Design a protein around this ligand. Structure first.
Ligand code: 58Q
Length: 466
């Protein structure tokens, strides 16, 4: 290092002292990713993993943080001999990047639960020799910064992380694993994934971080959870304040998911004088439209969740229709299973529960119910249209008869006289999927023909012998 100027704020005795440290680092030429991740992991450990002895805030003494920092930098500098990997042009080589990745990978415990909480930070790596998937990628970038490799940066999709490096920052390399039971492609480019138009690689519209965005990533990576039923209020407040610091300095401009995280925190505990959660969700969507060709799913899912929690059924349906309008221009590939799981839960659990409560409230006399609004029926239909269009030309199918039962049920929550008011043109809606085009006639009849719907959604050829 640490440099004298980095040590002057220690000891850190409060959340605000941690915010001051981040402010100071973010004001430097290069914020120190290693320092910052160790501090966050230290504080998270003593606020979320082990709170024994806690009276206010775990004091971060310079002696403790400097020793962790020395362990990390000694481990990396000792194992990576830069003289074996000459750098032309102030840029790194694939071989060097792969070496840094191997060094991190080879340091990890042979066997542990990869999906647990609080194994994201360099604190976890040094004290537990444990990292989660994206934590390995972050640790590679931190190590490269420690080594003076200014061109190596974190690349992020909505379910994976890797690195960019090299001339013009144009090279990509895998540095960590993805999912469970996938074969690792460490060392390789991400071009085959981009070319196949999978969600995992976002058609190439993934985030290419600068150092400031990498700070934002580690802040998003804070995990306030103590257990299933309990969050650390101290860690929530710290994450919230750090995200505001980043927001004010301009560093969330290109980070849709961080804006959604901040909005969720503001919903929980609003900060006086700040934009409402809805404003922030909309800024996340604007960020994705501006910088990422509107190819991201999570900006709309964050918005839909907020409306769902607040029982704004119309607005929740509209936001989920929007999620599907993004997904329809992807191919569903092996390794996209996480987004399949989220669409499945929305279609087959969340929407049914929302419409079930809506139906009870309609029986109880509600006015302006989404169930009496044809535009809400149109959103439900656009949702299914997008999922069906996603499935077209994909190497793996999406829909099956499990989805059909819930579709029939959800359609049935709207009376015939409401469904009839939607105009399906080749309230007005156009279908992109051949499945929904063929279902059009079925969608307005007073009694929904359940078996014909099922056949059209699953493209089931035949009916029972017997
Ligand atoms: C499974 O998680 C969710 C599902 C969600 C929602 C909102 C909705 C809705 N509607 N859903 C779907 C759902 C709702 N109920 N049941 C499912 C939300 C808000 C979430 C919460 N997740 C939103 C995305 C957030 N992810 C991130 N947030 C910031 N940065 C990054 S970088 C990255 C890739 C990497 F991990 F590094 F490999 C991921 C990621 C993690 C938390």
């Amino acid at each position: 290092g640490l440099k004298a100027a980095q040590k002057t704020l220690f000891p850190l005795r409060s959340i605000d002292d941690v915010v001051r440290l981040f402010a100071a680092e973010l004001g430097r030429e290069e914020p120190d990713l290693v320092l910052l991740s160790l501090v966050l992991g230290f504080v998270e450990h003593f606020l979320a993993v082990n709170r024994v002895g806690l009276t206010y805030f775990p004091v971060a003494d310079l002696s403790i943080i400097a020793a962790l920092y020395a362990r990390f930098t000694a481990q990396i500098r000792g194992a990576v001999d830069l003289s074996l990997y000459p750098r032309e042009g102030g840029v790194s080589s694939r071989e060097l990047v792969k070496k840094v990745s191997d060094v991190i990978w080879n340091s990890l415990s042979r066997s542990y639960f990869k999906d647990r909480a609080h194994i994201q930070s360099l604190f976890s790596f040094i004290t537990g020799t444990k990292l989660d998937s994206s934590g390995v990628a972050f640790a590679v970038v931190g190590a490269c910064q420690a080594l003076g490799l200014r061109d190596v940066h974190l690349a992020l999709s909505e379910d994976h992380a890797w690195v960019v490096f090299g001339p013009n920052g144009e090279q990509t390399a895998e540095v960590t694993w993805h999912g469970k039971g996938n074969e690792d492609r460490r060392g390789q480019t991400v071009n085959a994934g981009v070319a196949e138009r999978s969600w995992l690689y976002l058609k190439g519209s993934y985030m290419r971080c600068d150092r400031k965005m990498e700070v934002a990533f580690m802040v998003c990576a804070i995990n306030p959870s103590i257990d299933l039923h309990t969050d650390s209020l101290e860690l929530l407040q710290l994450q919230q304040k750090l995200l505001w610091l980043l927001y004010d300095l301009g560093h969330l401009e290109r980070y849709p998911m961080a804006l959604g995280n901040l909005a969720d925190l503001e919903e929980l505990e609003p900060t006086p004088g700040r934009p409402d959660p809805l404003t922030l969700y909309h800024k996340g969507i604007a960020s994705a439209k501006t910088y990422y060709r509107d190819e991201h799913i999570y900006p709309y899912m964050y918005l839909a969740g907020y409306h769902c929690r607040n029982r704004n059924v119309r607005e929740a349906l509209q936001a989920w229709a929007d999620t599907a309008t993004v997904i329809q221009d992807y191919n569903y590939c092996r390794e996209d299973e996480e987004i399949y799981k989220e669409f499945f839960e929305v279609a087959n659990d969340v929407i049914p529960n929302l419409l079930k409560e809506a139906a009870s409230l309609l029986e109880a006399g509600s006015q302006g119910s989404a169930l009496q609004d044809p535009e809400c029926f149109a959103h439900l239909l656009r949702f299914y249209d997008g999922i069906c269009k996603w499935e077209e030309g994909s190497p793996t199918p999406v829909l099956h008869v499990g989805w059909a039962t819930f579709l029939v049920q959800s359609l049935g929550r709207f009376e015939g006289q409401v469904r009839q008011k939607v105009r399906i043109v080749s309230p007005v809606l156009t279908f992109q999927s051949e499945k929904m085009k063929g279902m059009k006639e079925l969608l307005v009849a007073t009694k929904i023909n359940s078996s014909a719907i099922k056949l059209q959604l699953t493209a089931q050829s035949q009916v029972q012998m017997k």
